[PDB]
């Protein structure tokens, strides 16, 4: 979810929790030379952090183009390497884009394989399940317009393992030398690791690191922890007056496990509750036993898809106005009401200590 091509929010997926927090060096401006991105592409999750030189009203403009450029290639299904190379060739047409740096990674949901490239960009922190932090190795890539190419490495992340993409603003803090400030970020991430766990890992790291020391560049932190997927939801109920109350309760449990934001929860629970109520009241089978089937699942593209199937009734404008997409189908002996809703959690935009 974007506002003006800018990511104001992070997606939600079965096999990873993602959080994002950022600060902008300037005053009264929504963006600088930094950006982050997280694209849920089905069989994988692609993470992006980037830094454009000299922020800078001019630096935002450059960032905006690069972001749109990288997103277009990634979402068209090119690999990390191919995408980065498309962008590097594109930079010629984007003045000020030379020496922009990026860190891009792709998580395979099945294997935990996380293929990443550090294009002249400080390397990701890995916080493991047993609260060991350590930096992943730099891939050997350099920034845009460096002719270094874009070589890529891999790390296997287990369930509970997290990884932290960040910009140099996080570790180049006022009155702090690089190797000390690097080692403090790592230790603190370790410390905090012994909401969702990735939220506080992301939130608390950044706010203690900057608590006293302040900041002087753009700062962007994009964290994701691998998790075991919540199984899909399935309920088979009697077409009774309490059916909706039953479904709502369980749908709430489920969406909490999934890790959805309250707005998405409110939307989706509203839609499905109304489908169930409509099924009950409208409502023409005199056999009410197991007359209602509800199913809901989160896919790796960040959409929840749900269906309410009943034994036929004598919801569109309602549901179409609440969730990304809704549909109703009728046949003899049945009605199916469906919804598809994209999940998002907002990024945290902070302004504290200069
Ligand atoms: Mn910059
Ligand atoms: Mn910077």
UniProtKB/Swiss-Prot annotation:
Its cofactor is Mn(2+); Mg(2+). Optimum temperature is 37 degrees Celsius for phosphatase activity. GO terms for biological process: regulation of DNA-templated transcription. This is Multidomain regulatory protein Rv1364c. Induction: Induced by heat stress. Its EC number is 3.1.3.16, 2.7.11.1. Mn(2+) 1 binds at residues 51, 168, 217. Optimum pH is 8.5 for pNPP hydrolysis. Optimum pH is 8.0 for pNPP hydrolysis. The phosphatase domain is activated by the anti-sigma factor kinase domain. Exists in solution as both monomer and dimer. Both the phosphorylated and unphosphorylated proteins form extended dimers. Interacts with SigF. Can efficiently bind to SigF independently of its autophosphorylation. Interaction between SigF and Rv1364c is reduced significantly upon the phosphorylation of both proteins by PknD. The modification Phosphothreonine is found at residues 139, 220, 338. Multidomain protein in which the components of the entire signal transduction cascade for SigF regulation appear to be encoded in a single polypeptide. Contains an N-terminal PAS sensor domain, followed by an adjacent PAC (PAS domain-associated C-terminus) region, a phosphatase domain, an anti-sigma factor kinase domain, and a C-terminal anti-anti-sigma factor domain (or substrate domain). The chain holds residues 169 to 536 of 653 of the full protein. Primarily acts as an independent SigF regulator that is sensitive to the osmosensory signal, mediating the cross talk of PknD with the SigF regulon. Possesses both phosphatase and kinase activities. The kinase domain functions as a classic anti-sigma factor-like kinase to phosphorylate the anti-anti-sigma factor domain at the canonical regulatory site, and the phosphatase domain antagonizes this activity. Changing residue 274 to K: Abolishes autophosphorylation. Changing residue 282 to A: Abolishes autophosphorylation. Residues 227-354 are annotated as: Anti-sigma factor kinase region. Autophosphorylated. Phosphorylated by PknD on multiple threonine and serine residues. Phosphorylation is antagonized by the phosphatase activity. One of its GO terms (molecular function) is manganese ion binding. The modification Phosphoserine is found at residue 324.
């Amino acid at each position: 979810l974007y506002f003006q091509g800018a990511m104001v929010s992070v997606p939600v997926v079965p096999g990873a929790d993602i959080a994002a927090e950022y600060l902008v060096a300037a005053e009264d401006t929504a963006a600088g030379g930094d950006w982050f991105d997280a694209l849920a592409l089905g069989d994988r999750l692609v993470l992006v952090v980037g830094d454009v030189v000299g922020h800078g009203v001019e630096a935002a403009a450059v960032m905006s183009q690069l972001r749109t450029a990288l997103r277009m290639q990634i979402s068209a299904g090119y690999t990390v390497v191919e995408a980065l190379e498309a962008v590097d060739r594109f930079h010629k047409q984007v003045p000020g884009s030379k020496s922009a740096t990026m860190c891009v990674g792709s998580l395979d949901f099945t294997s935990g394989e996380f293929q990443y490239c550090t294009a002249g960009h400080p390397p990701p922190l890995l916080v493991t399940a047993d609260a060991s932090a350590r930096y992943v190795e730099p891939t050997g890539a350099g920034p845009l317009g460096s002719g270094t190419g874009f070589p890529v490495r891999s790390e296997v992340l287990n369930i509970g393992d997290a990884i932290l993409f960040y910009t140099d603003g996080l570790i180049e803090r006022p009155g702090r030398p690089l190797e000390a400030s690097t080692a403090e970020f790592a230790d603190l991430a370790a410390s905090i690791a012994s909401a969702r766990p990735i939220d506080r890992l992301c939130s608390d790291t950044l706010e203690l690191l900057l608590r006293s020391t302040g900041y002087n560049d753009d700062v962007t932190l994009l964290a994701m922890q691998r998790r075991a997927p919540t199984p899909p939801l399935h309920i088979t109920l009697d077409a009774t007056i309490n059916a909706a109350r039953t479904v709502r309760a369980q749908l709430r449990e489920w969406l909490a496990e999934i890790g959805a934001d309250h707005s998405d929860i409110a939307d989706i629970v509203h839609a499905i509750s109304e489908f169930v109520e409509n099924a009950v009241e409208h409502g023409y089978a005199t056999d009410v036993s197991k007359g209602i089937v509800v199913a809901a699942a989160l896919a790796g593209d960040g959409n929840v898809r749900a269906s309410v199937i009943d034994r036929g009734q004598w919801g569109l404008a309602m549901a179409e106005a609440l969730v990304s997409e809704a549909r109703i189908m009728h046949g003899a002996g049945g009605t199916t009401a469906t919804l598809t809703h994209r999940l998002s959690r907002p990024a945290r935009f902070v302004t504290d200590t200069m």
